[PDB]
């Protein structure tokens, strides 16, 4: 099976709890995953919302191409396992939602499921494994509300046929 590679003592640091519900609880053990669930014909995952633009705190560009990406561009980041070591960078994947819709998006970043609760992350926990972290364009193309903010999805990397 796949199981955690380690555990992480939580720290809150200077994190603003009154505006961040998800900061590290300070002393709580957070699991670490260099792994991800198996990749199959239609891999199950949790779709998440994020922007890959600049223009706030001072986070950096995406891991695969050293660049920022418009909210209007359909880009995703994968859990460390699925991300393997950039083996899927620039790859396009198909994402399918429960409402019956699909979309392609380009892998450009990693959703770090190992590191967290230090200053470089905003004292926030590691990403889960099994996460697909997507721009607002992916949500619009799927026709999802983006106020549910996590939805169950499937994703593939298999090719298609034309005529």
């Amino acid at each position: 099976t796949c199981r955690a590679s380690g555990y992480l003592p939580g720290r809150s640091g200077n994190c603003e709890k009154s505006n961040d519900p998800d900061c590290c609880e300070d002393g709580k053990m957070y699991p670490q995953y260099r792994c991800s669930p198996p990749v199959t014909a239609s891999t199950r995952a949790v779709l998440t919302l994020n922007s890959f633009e600049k223009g706030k705190d001072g986070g950096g560009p995406s891991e695969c191409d050293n660049a920022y990406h418009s909210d209007q561009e359909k880009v995703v980041a994968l859990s460390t396992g699925w991300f393997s070591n950039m083996a899927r960078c620039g790859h396009r994947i198909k994402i399918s939602a429960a409402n019956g819709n699909s979309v392609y998006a380009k892998v450009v970043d990693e959703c770090d499921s190992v590191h967290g609760c230090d200053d470089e992350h905003n004292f926030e926990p590691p990403c889960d494994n099994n996460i697909v972290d997507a721009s607002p364009a992916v949500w619009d193309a799927l026709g999802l509300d983006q106020n549910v903010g996590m939805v169950d999805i499937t994703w593939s990397e298999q090719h298609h046929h034309h005529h």
């Binding site: 003592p9 300070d26 950096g60 230090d118």
Partner: protein
């Protein structure tokens, strides 16, 4: 004992701030030397003479570590500062793309190709040799900047050892699960601990700021003489091929030296 784990996390973040402030001074000192002009006659000899005549010894803790077995791997021949002679293994191929996105592999691969110099001393020596020999460059200014760079790069990578113990203190459960398991070699543990020290997402985070710095800070102002060919490439090559890997190598060695703490 989890107050201590949180306490170490607080000093890891302070240690991380100290490490990042070495970026600009290193990039500034390289650009100062390369803007000055060509290489002075026998200034490679003059730099060693200056190092010999002004031998700054390290902090005692580092001194004590530089004479045990695991730490003496970063001991350098007098009068060179520590770690400037440590050779990283060749880990990527001769045609590797170093600095632009490649579908399926990523960006900013860390390590040495067959054709890059062996250690930071060789590397900074070939850059100096790449310059014209000049009769007009001030020897005192040239030598001193070369000296100042050598102390900067060694002080930078040596902060890996305080960083390592700070990480160990916070993440002791993770590292002790490797440091006690007797099944594996000494080297097999060493590889495991580096696998857990690896964080390529923030190496890309660091190297991209280093790239931006080496471009903005090498801007040509009105009527300025251009920098030598490829000084901007060599700046990032210094971080990407030596500073980053040698630092995590130092901080891997530091963790194995502390296996009795479990």
């Amino acid at each position: 004992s989890e107050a201590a784990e949180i306490e170490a996390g607080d000093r890891l973040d302070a240690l991380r701030d100290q490490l990042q402030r070495y970026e600009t001074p290193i990039i500034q000192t390289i650009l100062a030397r390369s803007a000055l002009g060509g290489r002075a006659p026998s200034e490679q000899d003059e730099v060693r003479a200056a190092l010999s005549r002004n031998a700054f010894e390290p902090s005692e803790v580092i001194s004590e570590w530089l004479q045990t077995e695991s730490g003496a791997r970063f001991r350098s021949t007098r009068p060179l500062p520590p770690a400037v002679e440590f050779i990283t293994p060749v880990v990527l191929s001769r045609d590797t793309v170093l600095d632009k996105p490649v579908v399926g592999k990523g960006i900013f691969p860390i390590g040495r190709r067959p054709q890059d110099p062996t250690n930071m001393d060789e590397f900074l020596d070939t850059s100096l040799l790449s310059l014209n020999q000049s009769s007009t460059v001030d020897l005192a200014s040239a030598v001193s900047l070369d000296v100042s760079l050598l102390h900067l790069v060694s002080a930078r990578v040596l902060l890996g050892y305080p960083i390592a113990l700070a990480k160990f203190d916070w993440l002791h459960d993770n590292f002790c699960h490797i440091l006690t398991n007797t099944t594996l070699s000494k080297s097999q543990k060493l590889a495991n601990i580096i696998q857990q020290l690896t964080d390529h997402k923030q190496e890309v985070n660091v190297l991209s700021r280093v790239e931006q710095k080496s471009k903005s800070l090498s801007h040509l102002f009105r009527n300025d003489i251009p920098y030598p060919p490829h000084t901007q490439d060599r700046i990032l090559r210094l971080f990407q091929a030596y500073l980053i890997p040698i630092t995590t190598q130092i901080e891997a060695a530091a963790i194995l030296d502390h296996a009795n703490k479990c």
